[PDB]
Amino acid sequence: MAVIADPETAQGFRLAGLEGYGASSAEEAQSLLETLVERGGYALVAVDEALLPDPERAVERLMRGRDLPVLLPIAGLKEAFQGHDVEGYMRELVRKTIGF
Amino acid sequence: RMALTVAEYLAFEHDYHVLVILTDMTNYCEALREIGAAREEIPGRRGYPGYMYTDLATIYERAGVVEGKKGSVTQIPILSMPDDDRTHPIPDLTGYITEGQIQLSRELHRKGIY
Amino acid sequence: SQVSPTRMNLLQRRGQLRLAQKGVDLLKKKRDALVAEFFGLVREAMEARKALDQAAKEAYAALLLAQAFDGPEVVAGAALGVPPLEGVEAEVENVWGSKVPRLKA
Amino acid sequence: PPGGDMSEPVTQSTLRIVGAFWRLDASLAFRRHFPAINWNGSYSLFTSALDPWYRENVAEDYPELRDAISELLQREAGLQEIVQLVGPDALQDAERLVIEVGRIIREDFLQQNAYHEVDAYCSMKKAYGIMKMILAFYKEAEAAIKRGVSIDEILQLPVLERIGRARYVSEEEFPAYFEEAMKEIQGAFKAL
Amino acid sequence: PPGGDMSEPVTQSTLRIVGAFWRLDASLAFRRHFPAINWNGSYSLFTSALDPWYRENVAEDYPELRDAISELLQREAGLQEIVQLVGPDALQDAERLVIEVGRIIREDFLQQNAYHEVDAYCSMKKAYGIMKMILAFYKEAEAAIKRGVSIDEILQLPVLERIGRARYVSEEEFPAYFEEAMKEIQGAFKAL
Amino acid sequence: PPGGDMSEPVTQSTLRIVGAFWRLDASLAFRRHFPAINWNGSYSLFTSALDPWYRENVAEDYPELRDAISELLQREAGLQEIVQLVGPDALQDAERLVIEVGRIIREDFLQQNAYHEVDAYCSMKKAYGIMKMILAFYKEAEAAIKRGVSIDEILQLPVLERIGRARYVSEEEFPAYFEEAMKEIQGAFKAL
Amino acid sequence: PPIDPLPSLSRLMNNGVGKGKTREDHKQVSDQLYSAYANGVDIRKLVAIIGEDALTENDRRYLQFADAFERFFINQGQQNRSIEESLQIAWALLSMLPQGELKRISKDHIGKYY
């Protein structure tokens, strides 16, 4: 695995039982993200909502399809955050399904 | 008709294997049409004559290897028929008449394959 | 060049309308089913997510300046790392909307 | 048809109101069916009067199996259409069931040649035989899927190829040939 | 016609001479309501030239109503299809409000009998009042979602039922029934 | 064609003759790009009859350069199909390559303005010329994108505009701008 | 017989016999079976794309219903039947559909027989 998150929160996912290779190195973590999924020698790759890639096309064109998922939303910090309910719901309705 | 009688003369009665090659059997059909309607007779093959049959019989049926002759009239018709319709008079009767056929199309003529 | 005949083609083109209109009728309610249920999974998804995101992090973020030298200790007692080649359990499943694979972590 | 239409007075009055009506397509016959028939669009009016002799002489399940083969052949048509509409994006166990079977049926039972005496001939037992082989392959397939046997492997049994080498078999040899082959189906299905 | 083609003489000739098609559709007929006029598949080229005289003889705001109110149904036709596939429940109040008003025009106003004597024979002084109230309910309903009002509340109003009782009365009771029905609407979104 | 198809007797006759053909289509013509010509709709037999007098007067590399434009738009027919079924943004790089080579073969080379006089003039020098412009671009872009570049970025690069000079350049001041810009194609795109 | 009820429709069925001359239930039981059948001939071409196991409960019953309709109702060969025995078949087939899926008959008809 790898979880791709903030440096300090990336820290807590490198612990045993889990395998992380996080940290920020960009504002969408491109510096890392790209290089890492290119091999696809991690069981799971996950990109948080404290980064999240504004061009998802960038990744798809480089990995060249994947049977394992990518960019699973994790919050990426704690501040009592739970806006990732309604945010993900609308993330869905904008690109697919019905409008508003 | 005229040409084919000079086939009969040289394949059969002077024993040589003569290849006859007939082309522009659409320009044939132009002239066939003329007599079709300008004479008394009425159209009966979806706007072309009905004595058309005989006109494409007398032509094609002469040809054939005869048993006792060494020589032969091998006829190769080359059509040029309007568009790629198959209800058109020309490919109509011609199909039926001949045994074994060959087609050209536009699938392999966009590829440069001659 | 390529033009349609009339007599031969007629019978094909009348049954063309029979074939098309009916086919598309039921094609229509084929995907409709699947999207209705999809709302159910997207909503329900985030239920556990708010609950367990915060109680994971609870301890994490409170073990960063008491860690960086107790990092060693914590990783030792615990069960060693998940495999990087298929540590997750991948499932294959053929379904309408093409063959898409799933998985559970 | 002189103009290429199968809808005209003279076809209806006495060429389609008779015992049997048949049809031909142009790329149909070219594959290897000589002569070729349309599976659906072709009927027989007389068929309720040909049932006595076929019952008594051949077998009392010759009229039953011959309607039973025709059912499968025309039921595949059900799916055929949707294939040319937007396709199967979902292959299931009940999907490719009818579909592959029917394939084999059109491949070996309607591809016959009239230039070869091994690809056709007048004989009860050849008709009887071939149609019983296919019955067998069919029979077991329905109970293959339930157990958990992928249709992909169903292709890859060699016995499909055994039924695909019944259309070359010598006429005289066929009885002993058939009897040895009925056993291989039922063995390479129930085992796997 | 048995089906009618636009490349048949009968159809492309008539089409021009008359100014109106008052089309009924089959879907609409199974629903057992007369008028069954399918508005999207009807037109009448007259309307334009009839607006002067309408308000001259009939009543003031009568033309103003008819042209204006038609839009409900328009902005419902393309809306329902597959966009509202389970009703609106994932949709905004904007889009919800259309089908709340949609409900009253198509279950009360479009429907009428012809085998009940209370509403087989109508007249202007009756129809006009019906039609006014249903404008005035779009006008107070769309204003409801800017106040913060849900459709739950709208779906329990006695107003919806009052629209249904204004055609289960005749033209004689209309004056009294118009008093009560009208003023009810104004005091049934000033409660919300 | 009075009827709007070539199935008409008066138009089938005009296609009994041979030599060269041309096809003008309603759809290209709208865009105000005249002459409107289809590579899928014509043939000529003066291609190989004119090849002697080409490599004698015109240039040696003129029986060669003509073939080198044809291939481009050969592949464009085949791929146009695919484009309308699923966008080419989903497809790989090299698919979209020749598509946008193609743009300039219409934008600035199927528009010969009958209202601008530097397109109203054309001759072998303006022929052969712009044929080598296009040639360059093709062979460079094919290698450029095998170094990981995307046709997206290249549309923004000055190289796209540059080949577009064919109607912003003269007839009888043309040998000043020909060679000039030609060089920058093989120069300033393999630097970038 | 091959008779399909879907393209068919009598224009006169009320201007022929009436209530009590064909039993009173006949009227609405005719527009039950219409809608029950019709629904199912469209999910026979969805019986293995998506399946019937991924389909609603209601629609799963509406499949089997169609199949038993051809077998028992349409077909009977040369066997005779009366108005009453045909309405009998109908009821049995309709018991399989819940009362919630019976809405094309009166409350009178549901409480007449299931």
Query: Other CB atoms closer than 10 Å to residue F87's CB: what's the count?
Result: 10
Q: How far apart are CA D98 and CA D75, in angstroms?
A: 8
Q: How far apart are CA C71 and CA C64, in angstroms?
A: 9
How many Cα atoms within 13 Å fall on the side-chain side of residue E12?
5
**Cis peptide upstream of residue E175 (ω within 30 degrees of 0):** no
Inter-chain residue contact D3 with B86, CB threshold 8 Å: no
Give the residue among C104, C84, C82, C83 at the shortest CA–CA distance from A42. C84
Mapped onto helix, strand or coil, the DSSP state of residue E14 is: helix
**Cis peptide upstream of residue G98 (ω within 30 degrees of 0):** no
Q: Output the domain CATH number for residue A90.
A: 3.40.50.10580
Q: How far apart are CA E146 and CA F62, in angstroms?
A: 73
Mapped onto helix, strand or coil, the DSSP state of residue B20 is: strand
Rg of chain D (C-alpha set) = 18
Q: How far apart are CA F18 and CA B23, in angstroms?
A: 14
The C-alpha of A25 sits at a distance from chain E's nearest C-alpha, in angstroms, of 38
Determine what percent of chain A falls in helix, strand and coil, rounding each to the nearest 5.
35, 5, 60
Strand partners, B78: B23
Cα E186 to Cα A1, E134, E165: the distances in Å are 64, 12, 17
Q: How far apart are CA F171 and CA F173, in angstroms?
A: 6
Looking at the complex, does the CB of residue C34 fall below 8 Å from at least one CB of chain D? Answer: no
* Contact criterion met (CB below 8 Å) for G47 and G24: no
- Method of elucidation: cryo-EM
Looking at the complex, does the CB of residue C11 fall below 8 Å from at least one CB of chain B? Answer: no
Mapped onto helix, strand or coil, the DSSP state of residue D99 is: helix
Mapped onto helix, strand or coil, the DSSP state of residue G26 is: helix
Compute φ and ψ for G62, nearest 5 degrees: -65, 5
For chain A, how many structural domains are there in total? 1
> Encoding tokens for residue G88?
């009998």
Cα E31 to Cα C86, E26, E110, G67, G109: the distances in Å are 58, 9, 11, 28, 20
DSSP G100: G
* Contact criterion met (CB below 8 Å) for E170 and E118: yes
* Contact criterion met (CB below 8 Å) for A99 and E83: yes
Looking at the complex, does the CB of residue B103 fall below 8 Å from at least one CB of chain D? Answer: no
Residue type, G30: S
Q: How far apart are CA A69 and CA A1, in angstroms?
A: 11
Q: How far apart are CA A41 and CA C86, in angstroms?
A: 9
Opening angle at CA C99, ends C95 and C103, nearest 5: 90
* Contact criterion met (CB below 8 Å) for F70 and F101: no
Inter-chain residue contact F16 with B110, CB threshold 8 Å: no
Documented resolution in Å: 6.4
Cα C58 to Cα C47, C53, G4: the distances in Å are 18, 9, 68
DSSP C85: T
Residues 6+ apart with CB under 8 A from F162: F181, F184, F185
Q: How far apart are CA E86 and CA F167, in angstroms?
A: 57
Cα E183 to Cα A92, E61, E120, E141: the distances in Å are 45, 18, 26, 15
Q: How far apart are CA F162 and CA D120, in angstroms?
A: 70
Q: How far apart are CA E19 and CA E8, in angstroms?
A: 19
Biggest CA-to-CA distance, chain G: 46
Inter-chain residue contact C1 with B86, CB threshold 8 Å: no
Cα F143 to Cα A58, D180, F146: the distances in Å are 21, 63, 5
Inter-chain residue contact C96 with D89, CB threshold 8 Å: yes
For chain E, list residues whose CB is within 8 angstroms of any CB belonging to chain C: 82, 85-86, 90
Give the residue among B16, B12, B25 at the shortest CA–CA distance from B89. B25
* Contact criterion met (CB below 8 Å) for E65 and E132: yes
DSSP G73: I
* Contact criterion met (CB below 8 Å) for D44 and D19: yes
* Residues written for chain A: 100
| Architecture of the domain spanning D45-192 | Orthogonal Bundle (1.10)
The C-alpha of C102 sits at a distance from chain G's nearest C-alpha, in angstroms, of 17
> Encoding tokens for residue D59?
């077998």
With CA atoms as reference, the chain F residue closest to C4 would be: F7
Looking at the complex, does the CB of residue B110 fall below 8 Å from at least one CB of chain C? Answer: no
CA G68 to chain centre: 10
Q: How far apart are CA E67 and CA E63, in angstroms?
A: 7
Query: Do chains D and A touch, with touching meaning 3 or more CB–CB pairs less than 8 Å apart?
Result: no
- Strands (E) located in B1-114: 17-23, 64-65, 72-78
Q: How far apart are CA B78 and CA B61, in angstroms?
A: 16
Cα F50 to Cα F15, F46, F62, F66, F91: the distances in Å are 22, 6, 11, 12, 40
Query: Other CB atoms closer than 10 Å to residue F126's CB: what's the count?
Result: 19
Looking at the complex, does the CB of residue B15 fall below 8 Å from at least one CB of chain C? Answer: no
Question: What burial class does residue B80 get, using C-beta atoms within 10 Å of its C-beta: 0-12 exposed, 13-18 middle, 19+ buried?
Answer: middle
Give the residue among B23, B28, B20 at the shortest CA–CA distance from B72. B20
The C-alpha of B103 sits at a distance from chain C's nearest C-alpha, in angstroms, of 14
Q: Which of residues 46-65 of C touch F (CB under 8 A)?
A: none
Cα A12 to Cα A9, C70, D26, F131: the distances in Å are 6, 12, 70, 62
Q: How far apart are CA G55 and CA G52, in angstroms?
A: 5
- How many C×E Cβ pairs under 8 Å? 7
Residue type, E143: A
Instruction: Sort out which chain A residues have CB atoms less than 8 A from C104's CB and list them.
Output: none
With CA atoms as reference, the chain F residue closest to B25 would be: F16
